[PDB]
Structure 1
């Protein structure tokens, strides 16, 4: 399948070169997979989600996304226009309040929730969790992400936005999950992207168009935007049968575009997520 006039990041993940604007992908499109978006919520009523999104858990007075961040990330995973995996099922877990803030204890509870809740969902092709959040190093936060991964969920986490080594942030620094840095449309490391040995992969993160609350759209930047590209890619590849939740991060690294990004510090992987789709 070909989506013309796609957001640059979608075009990038199906291309061997920057500077194109059509997204190419297998029509299976993540059907039969599920992606949890652990964030500020999801505006599931947005037409872009086509009934495939739902809130399953909140720790606050509402499950609605009063911020936009979680809706944007969910749109990059799986919206019809802005999403990588256009037929996946999206499940929202609201661990962040409407200002985008949340306590680590709530975030940990949300990760353990997903590890159990997947047993209440139909995801025959596999389960992914996208965590566009983080803070300072916490062994307990890292352990929660490790448990979620161990339980059979492909965990993708944002590297962080401090232009610093991600070893000092969580869950970014957990070795067993997929830690995602950000790139721009010219294949440069995004100016804010964290780096370091703990990164596994880069995805599009600067000037990413996606869904927003109020049935709207907007372009924003962050490792929060790169992470759902990788989460959606994992769901797509699992539906194709090319990989599994346990192996998807390594498979994405194996099959990435290699050596194409600029301003990658010595010792950080130079790997850009790529679907290897041959139309």
Structure 2
């Protein structure tokens, strides 16, 4: 299938080159797979989700995203217009408050939650977790992510927007997960994007169009935006049968566009998520 006049990020991910406008992808579209969105919640009634999204857990007084961050990320994952894996299932996990804050024990609780909850879901093609949040280094947070990954879930985490080595941030620094940097239109490292050896792969994170609260849409920038492209991509490849949860991150780097990124410091990968589609 082919989505004409798609947002740049989707197009980028199905091209070997920057500057195109069509998003080429298999019609299967990540159906049969599940993506947990661990953020501020999802606005589940948003028409773009076609009813494929639902909140599953809150750690606060409400199950609603009064922030926008989560709804934006979910859209990049599998919303009709704005998402990678247009027919996936989405589950919202609200670990962050409407102010976007969240204590580590809550984020650790949300991760253990996902590792358990997935057992009572019907997700034949597999399970993915998309985590566009972070903070200063923490071993417990890291270990929570590792557990999640080990439980059989594709874990993808934002590298952070400090324009620093991600090694000092969690859970970006956990080696076992899929730490995602951000890029821009022109195949440049996004200026805010963290870097370092712990990075596994890059994705589009600058000026990404996505769903927003109140049934709207918004362009925003960040490693949060990049993270979902990858999680959405993994979900997609899992339904096609190309890879598994355990090996998705590796697979994505093997098959990536290599050497195209600029502004990539020595020691960081020059790897750009790529679906390798061929009609």
Where on the TM-score scale, by shorter chain, does this alignment land: which range? Answer: over 0.9
Q: What secondary structure sits across from 1:134 in the alignment?
A: strand
Q: Which digits, 9 at most, give the CA deviation of each residue in 1:158-205, with x for residues without a partner?
A: 000000000000000000000000000100000000000000000000
- Give per-residue Cα distances to partners, 1:197-240, cap 9 Å, x unaligned: 00000000000000000000000000000000000000000000
Q: 2:238 and 2:122 mapped to 1: Cα distance? A: 14
For 1:129-156, what per-residue CA distance to the aligned partner results, in whole angstroms no more than 9, with x for missing partners?
0000000000000000000000000000
- Taking structure 1 as the reference length, the TM-score comes to 1.00
Structure 2 CA distance for aligned equivalents of residues 137 and 262 of structure 1: 27
Counterparts of 1:179 and 1:163, CA distance in 2: 14
Determine the C-alpha separation between the residues in 2 that align with 1:173 and 1:12: 26
Question: Which secondary structure state, in structure 2, belongs to the residue aligned with residue 198 of structure 1?
Answer: coil
Q: Give the distance between the partners of 1:274 and 1:266, measured in 2 at CA.
A: 22
Alpha-carbon deviation of 1:120? Answer: 1.0
Q: Distance in 1 between matches of 2:243 and 2:44?
A: 28
- 1:246 and 1:101 map into 2 onto residues whose CA distance is 30
Q: Which runs of 5+ in 1 are unaligned?
A: none
Partners in 1 of 2:185 and 2:112 — Cα distance?
35
Deviation at 1:98, TM superposition (A): 0.2
**Distance in 1, Cα, partners of 2:15 & 2:214:** 32
1:217: which partner in 2?
A: 217
CA distance in 2 between partners of 1:63 and 1:12 (Å) = 33
Q: Partner of 1:132 in structure 2?
A: 132
Deviation at 1:260, TM superposition (A): 0.1
Structure 2 unaligned runs (5+)?
A: none
Matched, 1:10 2:10: yes
Paired residues in the alignment total 279
Q: Secondary structure at the match of 1:75?
A: helix
- Provide Cα deviations, 1:89-142, integer angstroms capped at 9, x if missing partner: 000000000011100000000000000000011000000000000000000000
Q: Structure 2 length as normaliser, TM-score?
A: 1.00
